[PDB]
Design goal:
The structure is cut from a larger assembly and holds 1 copy of chain A (124 residues), 2 copies of chain B, 1 copy of chain C (107 residues), 1 copy of chain D (233 residues) and 1 copy of chain E (213 residues).
Chain A (H helix, E strand, L loop, with lengths): L2 E5 L3 E2 L4 E9 L7 E7 L6 E6 L8 E3 L8 E4 L5 E7 L7 E8 L12 E2 L3 E5 L1
Chain B lengths: L38 E2 L3 H4 L3 E2 L17 E3 L8 E3 L23 E15 L5 E6 L12 H5 L5 E3 L5 E9 L7 E8 L8 E7 L6 E5 L7
Antiparallel strand pairs in B: 2-10, 3-10, 4-9, 5-8, 5-10, 5-11, 6-7, 6-9
Chain E lengths: L6 H5 L3 E9 L7 E4 L6 H7 L2 E18 L13 E7 L21 E5 L7 E3 L8 E2 L18 E6 L8 E19 L29
Antiparallel strand pairs in E: 1-9, 2-8, 3-6, 3-7, 3-9, 4-5, 4-8
The chains are: A mainly beta (124), B mainly beta (219), C mainly beta (107), D mainly beta (233), E mainly beta (213).
Chain lengths: 124, 219, 107, 233, 213, 53
C-alpha cells in the first residue's frame, strides 16, 4: 500500500519561514516524481513544484508564482521529502498536500495518483 | 560604331537566369580552400542512410522515445497482428518526417524502392517467429495470418538472427507492410517477456526526383 | 492557459445521467488532461487520466471524452456516494493549471 | 586484445571511422605526441530503468584530465582527433539498446526563449550531463532544454543517425568504437571557447530485467587523443 | 533524373530576403540590412542541412518609387538616382543621411538611375575562415561566431527634395553561387522563434494516428 | 578472478612508483600508470613491477 503522511504546519508571522516535511512509505522512494500542491479555504488547487526521480538527476521545477522563495529537496539518508518555505505572505494560508506521479505507458503523463492527508499553514 | 539591335526581353530581371556579374570587391585575395571531411555532392547521399521510423504514434507516444518502439509480448492467442502501416504518401503516414521523407517533400515526383530493416531489441534468451507481409498496390490488407502467408512474406526467426530486411517499392490502396505473430515468445525463467522492435528505413540507392518545390513543413 | 468549468453548481436526482465540461483557452493534448475528485473534508483522488482512461478502483459509470480545446465527463447513472467536487488538470506548458471546480449535489 | 598507450592498458576483442578519413597531423605548430597520448577513462554512468540519456562535450571532458589539462593552459591553440571506446557490461538476462552518436557543432537550446545557456550547464567537466524525459520549464533563466525526443537541438531524435554512430544492442553487441577526425572551418582554433564534438548516448529501447538481477548497468567511456598538436614557442 | 538533386541545383536559387522603405525628405529615411542567411525561414531550413557552407554571393535590387501627397502647384520631378553602399566586415557605418561614411573610399557603392535594368552586384567568399558556419558551439556571448560576418548594405536617394516627398521601396534578391557543402545534418522539426539562435520549444515527433495496426 | 562465469565488472590496477604517494581517489589513480581489467573478457591480468632492497 502507498502511505504519504506529512507534518510541519503551524502559525508564522508574515515575513518569516516554515519547513514542511513529507514522510513516504510503501514504495521505492528514488523512482517517482514528488509534487507539492496547495489549496486555500474552499478555492481551486494550485501546483507549486515537483522533484524528478534518481534517473533524471533530482532536478526541480517550481511554479512561476513561488520561484525564488520556496525550495523543494530531499534527504539522502531516509525517504523524507522537504519543503522550505521562506518569505511568507498573507495569501499563503492554505492546506499543503504531497503527491506522487508514475509512468503509465512508458510515458510520463503529468497526473498525480496518490495524495497526502494535508497539513494546514496559516499566518498572522 | 558596330550596329546592334536589341531584342524583346532585354532589360528585364528574370530571377532564374545565369549571367556574369560585376564583382563588388575585386583585389581582395580570397581565402584558399581546406580539406574538411564529409563533403556532400548530392542529396541522395543524405537519403541513403538508415533512420528510425516512428511507427508507434498512438497520440500519446509522439512526445516520447516510445514512438519508435513496437510492443511485443507473449499473449495467449496464436496468430495476431504486431503492427501495420500503409505506404500511401503524404497523407500523414509514418515515413514522412524521417530522414528519407524530408528530402522527398522538396520535390513533386519521385519513384523508387525502399529498404526496411527491423531489429529485435529483446533478450538474448527469448525466441519466436514473425511473419513480414507486404501487400502490393491493389491487393487488400490481409485479415488473417493465413492469407497473409499466401502473399509475399518473410518468416523471421528471432532466435537465429536479430535483424531482417524487407525491400518494397514506393511511388508518388497503395500498399501495406503489416507484420504477424507466427509463434509466441518462448522465454526461460527469470527473463522478462515484454520485448521491443525498432524499424529502420532507407533508400535502396536507385531513384530519382523531379520538379523541386518547397516543403509543407512550415507556417 | 486557464480552464473554465461549467456548470459551477449542479443538482440531479439519483438514477439519471448528468455531465460536465471543461473548456480550455488554447489547445491541450488529449493525453495531458485528467480528472480528480475531492470529497468534503478529504484529499483529492485521481479519477480519470489522459481523458479516457479510468483509474484504479473507480466504478465503471464514468467515461471521459473530448478533444482539442473542449473536454467533458459523463456519469451514466448517478448514485448517492459520488457527490463531490470534480477538477480538471492540464499541461500545455508549465505550470499545471487546475479547473475552477464543479460541485455535484444529489436531489 | 590488450592495446596500450603510454602508461595505461585496456583490452578489447568492429570499428566505425569518422567520415571515411583517418586522423593525421598537418607560425610553427610543435608536435607533442608521447607525453599525453594515452587512454583517459572517465567515470562510469549508471543505466537505470527510466533513464533518458547522457552527453559529453569533447575537448572539455579532458580539461581537468592530468597532463592533457596542463597542456591546455600552456597553449592558446590546438587541433586534435579522437578515438572513443564505449562499452557497457550486462548479463544475458538484461535487455536494451543504446545509440552512441558523435555530433560535430552541437548547439544546445536554452529553456528561456530569449537567453542562451551558461558554461556550467552546457558541460560538466569530465562528468556526464543528463537528458530528461520531461520538459525544462521556461521560468528559469539559463538552462539547457533537454527534452530527449528533440535531443536538445530542436530536431527529430530518430534522425540522429546521419552523424557517425554505432548501435549497442545487448542481445548481440557489447561495445562501440568511434574514430573521429578533426572537423572545423579554420585549421587551428581557440580551444578555450569552442567544443567542436559532442558524444551522446541515448537509450532507445529502455533497460529491462527480471526481479533478482542487478537493477542497473554501468557504461564506461574511454577517450584517446590522436594527432594532437598545439601552436606556441 | 539525379541532376536536380545536386547541391548546386538545390541551393543556387533566387529568393527575396529583405523589404524596406525610405523617403528622401524625412531625415530618418535610409535602408539598412546586415547580411545574414537567417532572414527567411524557408531558405534558412535548406542551408541548415549542412554544417559548413562556402559560396559566392549575387544580389539584385528591385527599386521602385511612389509620389507622396505634397501640397499643391505642379510637382514635376526628374529621374531619380539611388546609392547602394556595401560595408565590408569591419568598416565604417552611417548613422544619418548626411554622414561622412557614405563618402569613404573603401565601401564600394553602385549608383543607379530609375528606368533602367536593376542594379546587380556580386560579392565573393568574404571571410577569414575556410568556410561559413551555420552552427557554432561556443563563445566569441554564446554561439555567435564573429568570423562568418558578410557585411551590411545601405540605401538612400542622392537627389535633394525638390517640391514634394517621394518614398521608395527596395526588394533584395539573394542567390548563392558555386556552393560547396560539408557535414550533413538532420532537418529541423521544431519551429523558428528568434533569428539569432537555435532556441525552441519542444514538440512531438510526428503527427499521430489512432491505433498502431 | 575466482567468481562466477556470469558475473561481469571492471577493475583498476594502480602502481605507484617510489616517491609518488598512494592515490586517494579512483581519478588520480587513473592518472598514473594502471591496467583496466575487464572481468567478463578474461579472468586473469598480469602486472609487472620492480622490487629493490
Amino acid at each position: 500500500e502507498v502511505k504519504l503522511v506529512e507534518s510541519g504546519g503551524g502559525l508564522v508571522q508574515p515575513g518569516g519561514s516554515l519547513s514542511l516535511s513529507c514522510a513516504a512509505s510503501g514504495f521505492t522512494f528514488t523512482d517517482y516524481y514528488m509534487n507539492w500542491v496547495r489549496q486555500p479555504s474552499g478555492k481551486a488547487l494550485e501546483w507549486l513544484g515537483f522533484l524528478r526521480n534518481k534517473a533524471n538527476g533530482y532536478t526541480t521545477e517550481y511554479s512561476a508564482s513561488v520561484k525564488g522563495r520556496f525550495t523543494i529537496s530531499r534527504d539522502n539518508s531516509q525517504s523524507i521529502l522537504y519543503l522550505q518555505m521562506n518569505a511568507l505572505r498573507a495569501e499563503d494560508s492554505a492546506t499543503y498536500y504531497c503527491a506522487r506521479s508514475r509512468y503509465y505507458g512508458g510515458t510520463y503523463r503529468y497526473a498525480l495518483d496518490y495524495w497526502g492527508q494535508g497539513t494546514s499553514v496559516t499566518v498572522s | 560604331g558596330l550596329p546592334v539591335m536589341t531584342t524583346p526581353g532585354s532589360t528585364q530581371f528574370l530571377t532564374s537566369d545565369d549571367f556574369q556579374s560585376p564583382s563588388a570587391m575585386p583585389q581582395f585575395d580570397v581565402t584558399p580552400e581546406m580539406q574538411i571531411p564529409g563533403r556532400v555532392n548530392n542529396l541522395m547521399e543524405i537519403a541513403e542512410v538508415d533512420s528510425v521510423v516512428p511507427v508507434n504514434n498512438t497520440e500519446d507516444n509522439v512526445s516520447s522515445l516510445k514512438a519508435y518502439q513496437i510492443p511485443v509480448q507473449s499473449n495467449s492467442d496464436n496468430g495476431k497482428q504486431v503492427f501495420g502501416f500503409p505506404l500511401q504518401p503524404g497523407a500523414n503516414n509514418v515515413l514522412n518526417r524521417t530522414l528519407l521523407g524530408e528530402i522527398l517533400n522538396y520535390y513533386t515526383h519521385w519513384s523508387g524502392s525502399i529498404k526496411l530493416t527491423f531489429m529485435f531489441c529483446g533478450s538474448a534468451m527469448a525466441t519466436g517467429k514473425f511473419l513480414l507481409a507486404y501487400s502490393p498496390p491493389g491487393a487488400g490488407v490481409p485479415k488473417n495470418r493465413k492469407d497473409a502467408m499466401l502473399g509475399t512474406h518473410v518468416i523471421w526467426d528471432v532466435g537465429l538472427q536479430s535483424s531482417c530486411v524487407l525491400c518494397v517499392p514506393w511511388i508518388s490502396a497503395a500498399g501495406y507492410v503489416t507484420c504477424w505473430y507466427q509463434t509466441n515468445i518462448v522465454v526461460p525463467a527469470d527473463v522478462q517477456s515484454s520485448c521491443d522492435i525498432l524499424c529502420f528505413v532507407s533508400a535502396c540507392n536507385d531513384f530519382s526526383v523531379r520538379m523541386l518545390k518547397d516543403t509543407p513543413f512550415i507556417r | 492557459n486557464v480552464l473554465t468549468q461549467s456548470p459551477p453548481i449542479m443538482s440531479a436526482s439519483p438514477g439519471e445521467k448528468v455531465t460536465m465540461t471543461c473548456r480550455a483557452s488554447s489547445s491541450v493534448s488529449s493525453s495531458y488532461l485528467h480528472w480528480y475528485q475531492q470529497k468534503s473534508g478529504a484529499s483529492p483522488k485521481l479519477w480519470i487520466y489522459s481523458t479516457s482512461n479510468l483509474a484504479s478502483g473507480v466504478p465503471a459509470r464514468f467515461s471521459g471524452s473530448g478533444s482539442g480545446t473542449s473536454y467533458s465527463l459523463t456519469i451514466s447513472s448517478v448514485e448517492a456516494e459520488d457527490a463531490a467536487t470534480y477538477y480538471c488538470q492540464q499541461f500545455s506548458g508549465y505550470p499545471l493549471t487546475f479547473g475552477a471546480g464543479t460541485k455535484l449535489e444529489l436531489k | 586484445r590488450s592495446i596500450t598507450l603510454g602508461n595505461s592498458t585496456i583490452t578489447t576483442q568492429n570499428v566505425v571511422v569518422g567520415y571515411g578519413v583517418w586522423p593525421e597531423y598537418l607560425d610553427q605548430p610543435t608536435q607533442p605526441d608521447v607525453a599525453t597520448c594515452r587512454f583517459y577513462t572517465l567515470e562510469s554512468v549508471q543505466w537505470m530503468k527510466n533513464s533518458a540519456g547522457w552527453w559529453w562535450k569533447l575537448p572539455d571532458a579532458l580539461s581537468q584530465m592530468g597532463l592533457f589539462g596542463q597542456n591546455m593552459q600552456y597553449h592558446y591553440l590546438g587541433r586534435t582527433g579522437y578515438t572513443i571506446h564505449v562499452q557497457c557490461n550486462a548479463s544475458k538476462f538484461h535487455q536494451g539498446c543504446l545509440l552512441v552518436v558523435c555530433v560535430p557543432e552541437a548547439e544546445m537550446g536554452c529553456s528561456n526563449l530569449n537567453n542562451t545557456p551558461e558554461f556550467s550547464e552546457l558541460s560538466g567537466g569530465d562528468s556526464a550531463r543528463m537528458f530528461t524525459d520531461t520538459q525544462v520549464g521556461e521560468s528559469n533563466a539559463k538552462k539547457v532544454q533537454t527534452a530527449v525526443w528533440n535531443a536538445g537541438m530542436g530536431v527529430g531524435v530518430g534522425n540522429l543517425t546521419i552523424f557517425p554512430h554505432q548501435w549497442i544492442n545487448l542481445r548481440t553487441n557489447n561495445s562501440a568504437t568511434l574514430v573521429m577526425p578533426y572537423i572545423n572551418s579554420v585549421p587551428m582554433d581557440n580551444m578555450f571557447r569552442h567544443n567542436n564534438l559532442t558524444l551522446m548516448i541515448i537509450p532507445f529501447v529502455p533497460l529491462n530485467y527480471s526481479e533478482g538481477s542487478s537493477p542497473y548497468v554501468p557504461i564506461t567511456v574511454t577517450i584517446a587523443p590522436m594527432c594532437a598538436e598545439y601552436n606556441g614557442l | 533524373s539525379r541532376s536536380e538533386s545536386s547541391i548546386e541545383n538545390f541551393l543556387c536559387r533566387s529568393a527575396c530576403v529583405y523589404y524596406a522603405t525610405y523617403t528622401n525628405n524625412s531625415k530618418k529615411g535610409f535602408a539598412e540590412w546586415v547580411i545574414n542567411t537567417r532572414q527567411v525561414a524557408q531558405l534558412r531550413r535548406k542551408l541548415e542541412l549542412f554544417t559548413y557552407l562556402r559560396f559566392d554571393l549575387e544580389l539584385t535590387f528591385v527599386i521602385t518609387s511612389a509620389q507622396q501627397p505634397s501640397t499643391a502647384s505642379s510637382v514635376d520631378a526628374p529621374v531619380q538616382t539611388h546609392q547602394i553602399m556595401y560595408v565590408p566586415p569591419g568598416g565604417p557605418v552611417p548613422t544619418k543621411v548626411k554622414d561622412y561614411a557614405w563618402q569613404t573610399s573603401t565601401n564600394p557603392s553602385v549608383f543607379w538611375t530609375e528606368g533602367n535594368a536593376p542594379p546587380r552586384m556580386s560579392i565573393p567568399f568574404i571571410s577569414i575562415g575556410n568556410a561559413y558556419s551555420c552552427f557554432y558551439d561556443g563563445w566569441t556571448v554564446y554561439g555567435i561566431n564573429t568570423l562568418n560576418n558578410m557585411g551590411t548594405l545601405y540605401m538612400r536617394h542622392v537627389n535633394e527634395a525638390g517640391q514634394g516627398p517621394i518614398k521608395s521601396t527596395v526588394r533584395i534578391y539573394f542567390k548563392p553561387k558555386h556552393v560547396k557543402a560539408w557535414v550533413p545534418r538532420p532537418p529541423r522539426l521544431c519551429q523558428y522563434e528568434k533569428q539569432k539562435n537555435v532556441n525552441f520549444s519542444p514538440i512531438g515527433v510526428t503527427t499521430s494516428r489512432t491505433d498502431i495496426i
